[PDB]
Amino acid sequence: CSHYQALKDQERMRKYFAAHPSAEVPADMWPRYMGAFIRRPLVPEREAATGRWGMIPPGTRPEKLAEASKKNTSNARSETAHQLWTFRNAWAKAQHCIIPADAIYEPDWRSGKAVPTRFTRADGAPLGIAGLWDRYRNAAGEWIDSYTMLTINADDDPLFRDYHQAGKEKRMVVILPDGAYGDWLTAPATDTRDFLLPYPADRLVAAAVKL
Template sequence: MCGRYSLTNSKSKEIMERFGPVQIEFEFEPRYNITPSQQVPVVINQNGNKRLLMFHWGLIPHWARDESVAHKLINARAETLTEKPSFRESFEQRRCLVLADGFYEWKKEGRVKIPYRIIMRDGKPFAFAGLWDTWLSPAGQRLNSCVIITTGSNTLMETIHSRMPVILPKNMESIWLDSAYPIHKVKALLKPFPSEEMSAYEVSSLVNSPRKDEPACIYPVNRLF
């Protein structure tokens, strides 16, 4: 699964260079320990234009009775997207990029869980494959929300955890956002990212607390591998 991640670079120029052309409508702060239920930066395709918006992490399908379902829907398994009512329609019509530059996973060593941060070898931002929806509250308020898709682990990640978020290659991001693209070809993108382009390192137990969101969360306490 993916329950914590980071986006430490919030400079509009660099975000534009990596994900542009994209319409950026707000400034956001560097984040070192993003947790479910928070507002997160995502890119969507709206009428042929890419827009960077802030969505609630935890999907609330438009047909949901209330927003309490969100805490259960932070991740969606790639293998069952077309089977689950919570995800099926969004997978076909409302796909998004969830921006990140690293994510955390915990490795079991006996009775202890050791936190690791997983990044690209070049240190640059990347995008998780995500889905989104808009829910209308009984009071008439619109709430945009998203979910991160997961798949089986690659050879790097399987030493830490059995699953990992789907990370999209840069040249496939536009296809992911295109709702007109054949869905069977889109589904083919939902596979583990190449291990050789990633690295992982142990980090402090600070990330265990959702209240901690500071640079020390990403500092290595052991060597890269």
């Protein structure tokens, strides 16, 4: 997933995630933009943090930022996130977050062309995408937050196995059930994979859209 609709409604975010927006974020989110992500609490009133969608290795030096910025790190394959330099620190320290979204978009190529497809929950509730967060220093030495969505294989998912170009492994982000939100945000690195499961396809609605 490299495109999603950010949850911006304050009341909606409070009801479902017990958090409120900090800064304004683009309703139409794309990689490398500054988006919002939610972390464990602790002013008892969660606040979504702002960060770059697309993780940057925390040890990156200023002379390597440009190079690191161009890599595709808005999604992280869960299978190797514990090992790769970009995500290892975040995974090891269990820096977990939830990206709140009203919907996510995935391309459908069955028509012979890229047709955007919008996915939403059948119950009308927002999606809580499982991810990792970390910090990196910009050229001025100022720490900046960044986040990425954890993905799992979807070659056998009843819904997502039909999306994306043919000829490449099929991937899907992890939509967390509401009852797992809090546990996910405080889970130790050893329990991480327990949450990276396929969200029930029968709970999602797919619709082709015109951007």
